[PDB]
Amino acid sequence: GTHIDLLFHPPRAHLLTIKETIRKMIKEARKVIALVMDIFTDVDIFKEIVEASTRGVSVYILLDESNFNHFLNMTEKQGCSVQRLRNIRVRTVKGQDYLSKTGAKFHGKMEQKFLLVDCQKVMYGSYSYMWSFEKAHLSMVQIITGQLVESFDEEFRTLYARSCVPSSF
Amino acid sequence: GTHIDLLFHPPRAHLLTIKETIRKMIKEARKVIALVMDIFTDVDIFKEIVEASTRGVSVYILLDESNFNHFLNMTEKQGCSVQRLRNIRVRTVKGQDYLSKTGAKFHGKMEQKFLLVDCQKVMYGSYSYMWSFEKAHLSMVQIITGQLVESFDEEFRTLYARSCVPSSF
Numbered sequence: 001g002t003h004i005d006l007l008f009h010p011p012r013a014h015l016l017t018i019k020e021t022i023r024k025m026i027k028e029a030r031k032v033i034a035l036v037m038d039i040f041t042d043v044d045i046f047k048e049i050v051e052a053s054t055r056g057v058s059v060y061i062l063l064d065e066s067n068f069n070h071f072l073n074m075t076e077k078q079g080c081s082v083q084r085l086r087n088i089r090v091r092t093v094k095g096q097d098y099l100s101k102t103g104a105k106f107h108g109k110m111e112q113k114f115l116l117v118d119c120q121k122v123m124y125g126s127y128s129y130m131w132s133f134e135k136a137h138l139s140m141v142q143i144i145t146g147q148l149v150e151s152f153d154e155e156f157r158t159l160y161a162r163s164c165v166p167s168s169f
Numbered sequence: 170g171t172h173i174d175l176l177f178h179p180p181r182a183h184l185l186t187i188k189e190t191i192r193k194m195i196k197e198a199r200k201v202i203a204l205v206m207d208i209f210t211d212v213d214i215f216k217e218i219v220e221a222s223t224r225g226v227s228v229y230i231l232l233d234e235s236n237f238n239h240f241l242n243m244t245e246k247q248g249c250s251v252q253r254l255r256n257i258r259v260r261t262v263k264g265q266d267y268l269s270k271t272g273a274k275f276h277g278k279m280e281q282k283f284l285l286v287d288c289q290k291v292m293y294g295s296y297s298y299m300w301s302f303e304k305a306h307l308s309m310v311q312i313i314t315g316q317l318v319e320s321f322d323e324e325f326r327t328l329y330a331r332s333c334v335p336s337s338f
């Protein structure tokens with residue numbers, strides 16, 4: 001009982017771009033937005049998220065730990081101290097711990113990208129929220145409704161349990 | 170009429186790893202394997218593909234253009250001249266053309282990855298065929314059967330039309 005549509009960038013036969021469909025999904029949020037993302041520097045999508053939070057929507061954002069400073073650098077340039085917005089919680093996720101042949105311990109990355117709105121609709125795919133995905137790259141997403149959404153909801157809760165408050169904060 | 174299962178790396182509550190499930194799909198192929206991948210340096214998955222082609226399976230591989238020589242280097246260090254395997258065709262795909270800040274002409278990346286076998290089963294997700302995805306990163310894939318598979322078959326044809334013979338050849 002799952003329906004899935006595809007969208008591409010650059011766009012193919014469909015009316016809206018991937019970025020226009022992201023904005024739509026955020027503006028249609030009534031209760032909760034859950035986002036997992038590797039790099040987030042797109043100002044227009046950030047402005048939609050902040051506008052949702054001001055109307056009372058709870059916003060939970062999980063960013064790859066190694067790329068977090070790109071997000072922070074964006075929010076400060078826009079004159080926003082994001083840590084002051086009580087309806088938004090931003091936390092970081094690490095990849096696996098591993099040991100290099102020089103013996104230093106490192107961690108890798110969270111390679112996972114999805115937007116989950118009101119525990120009811122998902123956009124999943126290879127599009128990251130940065131300028132290079134508008135101008136440079138080819139990407140694709142699924143728009144998902146029905147039973148599969150429940151599995152994205154479980155996985156979000158599992159990453160949220162693992163996630164940490166960012167060290168800058 | 171689409172069925173979907175999720176798998177994770179590191180693994181969760183499923184018996185097989187992502188890499189074991191990829192090997193299974195390739196071993197189960199009877200007629201054709203279609204792969205789109207950004208970076209391909211895993212020697213064990215390469216060996217399964219070559220074995221399939223020796224069985225008479227037709228193999229079509231689409232690789233991101235910028236990363237192609239990492240693939241070719243791996244096949245050469247394995248003692249294989251991949252150019253001579255008639256049942257495999259390897260071609261490259263480029264992202265969009267664009268102008269940088271300084272006015273230089275560059276192209277972006279194909280950010281797409283999926284495995285399509287016998288026009289009937291797809292593995293789609295964030296796992297790339299390289300060492301870092303086994304040891305360092307968190308990733309996820311979907312295993313897809315039913316009507317949505319037709320949409321992946323159409324997109325593979327469209328990307329195969331766009332694709333080029335690699336410049337390195």
Ligand SMILES: CCOC(=O)c1cn[nH]c1
Nearest residue numbers: 034060119153156157160
């Ligand atoms: C972190 C609190 O939020 C959740 O766990 C969530 C949000 N939507 N579905 C699950």
Ligand SMILES: CCOC(=O)c1cn[nH]c1
Nearest residue numbers: 201203229322325326329
């Ligand atoms: C001739 C290139 O191969 C395809 O178009 C294909 C393979 N499986 N589905 C479509």
